[PDB]
Amino acid sequence: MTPPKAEKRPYPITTHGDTRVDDYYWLRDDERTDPQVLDYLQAENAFTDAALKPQQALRETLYEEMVARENLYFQSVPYVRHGYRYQTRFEPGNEYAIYVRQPQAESEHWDTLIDGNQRAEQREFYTLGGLEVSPDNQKLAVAEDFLSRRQYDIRFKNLSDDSWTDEVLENTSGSFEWANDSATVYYVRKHAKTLLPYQVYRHVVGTDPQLDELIYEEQDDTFYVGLEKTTSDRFILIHLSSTTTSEILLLDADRADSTPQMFVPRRKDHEYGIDHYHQHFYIRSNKDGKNFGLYQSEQADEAQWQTLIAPRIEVMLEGFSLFRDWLVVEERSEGLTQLRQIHWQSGEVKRIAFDDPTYTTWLAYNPEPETELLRYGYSSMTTPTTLYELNLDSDERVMLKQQEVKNFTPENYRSERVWVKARDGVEVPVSLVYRHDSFARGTNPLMVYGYGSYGSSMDPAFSASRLSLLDRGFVFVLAHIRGGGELGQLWYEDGKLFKKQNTFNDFIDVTEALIAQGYGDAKRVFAMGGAAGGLLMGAVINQAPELFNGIVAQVPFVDVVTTMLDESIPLTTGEYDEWGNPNQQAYYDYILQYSPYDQVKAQDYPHMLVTTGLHDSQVQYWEPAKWVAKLRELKTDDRQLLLYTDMDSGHGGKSGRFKAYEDIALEYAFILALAE
């Protein structure tokens, strides 16, 4: 079958006297209306449909077995907050969650707080982006998106009679806090054009939003504006943060006329976050070390901050929770997540021990500090996600919930942590899982998954959908490459800006070691990654095409120089601290060397499926479309190259989780057919 051939319209882009001619610059159409652009995306979708037509039966088998291992009756673990018990309920044949509550001393009767199915009646789209009852338990504030544009309407329900007030706060981030009067709420307004959060307003419930007062306006575009409330309830925080740099303003939660009080003025490369409890500020801050410390203060002044935990090169400090008698910290060390608890009085330290080679642990939702019971999450490549509750004093651990997986026997699978010595001598961790009875050294197809940007960690956890590959002989690998966070801030920093190439080198060095050690069949190595992990997919296949049989590149960031030169593209002005600004000759040069679109060569490429989405305003559909067009023009092999563009507008990843399972089934069928 003859693949679609995009029209070439040579478009020169000249930077620092370097001219790049982009034949497909025209595929970018911000209005997503141009019929010629739509024609190319439709033709590629038709080609993908026709190429993958024989995989239909396998797609059905995969889809049905993925849905079959999940319950359709889900009920959350109930939690208590301000004398009420809260539960979320999904029943089969309901797109949306029902949220219920009852008085804490009640068992029998539950009251509906909000039914998403009911709220979605006569609407094209529904996302709940926020839910919070007032301190006096009388009012519900909800942040809802009916239009799919990530702009939230805040509305108010009287819980006494289930009546709604008739005002709406429009174009909000969904971030809002009640003042302690259960009458005033603070909310974040998004910029009209950029949709970036930039204003804090104050609303009296029951009044017209025209009466609302502007409390704070952020001048720096790169600074996210979010609202928080301290554990003590004494302060509403205006949390301002770039990727590198923080600033917190305090709002007295106990007055109706409060103005923002500076905590510590922003200083480039000083990231901090605060809470308030027991008459102290608690600060997680990188002021003295990239791996962060914890500080106590009676006042804002940075020089008064007292050190509770000093930053350590070996231990990244990720977060903390405050309880009556205990401090609990989330840390990473030697490539594992950990929890430690420290007694406020005795200074007694306990670590929460797990022996699984490939697990992750985290602080879960603990809305009440007056307790000895900690809720924390656990998952491994062999153990479905678990909520535990720990008695911090007695060390008694109970299981509150497990992820229910049907047709699944945990003993059928093995997992391992492998360390690979990268080409520059740096040790890269790897987490891998496979079915015991079908494993034979050098025989198995290998799926290598990476991300490797922003300090995001691909922490090893359980996947139900992954069983569809493991039960078909695949060794599934997480490559914990530089640019991720698995070994702390230095791990991230050694895979961004002028070290970004280490991300792609680590992925190739990991893949080569695994093949050398017989984890996979050299001829049946597959890889997948999405977004900045699609950047990884693009760079790896330019640099080392021969390693991989097949590739899935989801919504890939591939036109890196051109996108990062254009502040009109959503996200660009917030990403200079990740890739660099190619307006500077040093960054242009460094970035162009890996920018996958720019490094497409007349060479043999793996089989590849590239995905994207038309109407998702923060998915830049043109980048993978241009990339596929250029690959079609230059590649020397006869292997399959497909572009699938989601033409939808709605549902996304939840409720249309069936859409999510459909995409997984398509992608896994594509790979399984190549590995057969």
Author numbering: 2 to 677
Task: Recite the paper's sentences.
Two domains are linked by a hinge region that participates in the transition of the enzyme between two major states—closed and open—in which domains and residues of the catalytic triad are located close to each other and separated, respectively. In this study, we described for the first time the structures of bacterial OpB from S. proteomaculans (PSP) obtained by X-ray for an enzyme with a modified hinge region (PSPmod) and two of its derivatives. The enzymes were crystallized in the presence of spermine and adopted uncommon intermediate states in the crystal lattices.
Despite its small effect on thermal stability, the presence of Sp made it possible to obtain crystals suitable for X-ray analysis for PSPmod and its derivatives, PSPmodE125A and PSPmodS532A. PSPmodS532A carried the alanine substitution of the catalytic triad serine and did not possess any enzymatic activity. PSPmod and two its derivatives (PSPmodE125A and PSPmodS532A) were crystallized in intermediate conformations, which are characterized by a disruption of the catalytic triad typical for ligand-free enzymes in open states, while domains’ closeness resembled closed states of ligand-bound POP. In the PSPmod structure, the distances between Cα-atoms in the pairs Ser532–His652 and His652–Asp617 are equal to 18.2 and 10.6 Å, respectively, which are longer than those in the closed states of TbOpB and ApPEP and comparable with those in the open state of TbOpB and intermediate states of PfPEP and GmPEP. As a result, five, three and two bound Sp molecules were found in the structures of PSPmod, PSPmodE125A and PSPmodS532A, respectively. Sp701 is present in all structures, while Sp704—only in the PSPmod structure. The second Sp of the PSPmodS532A structure is in the proximity of catalytic Ser532 similarly to Sp703 in the PSP structure.
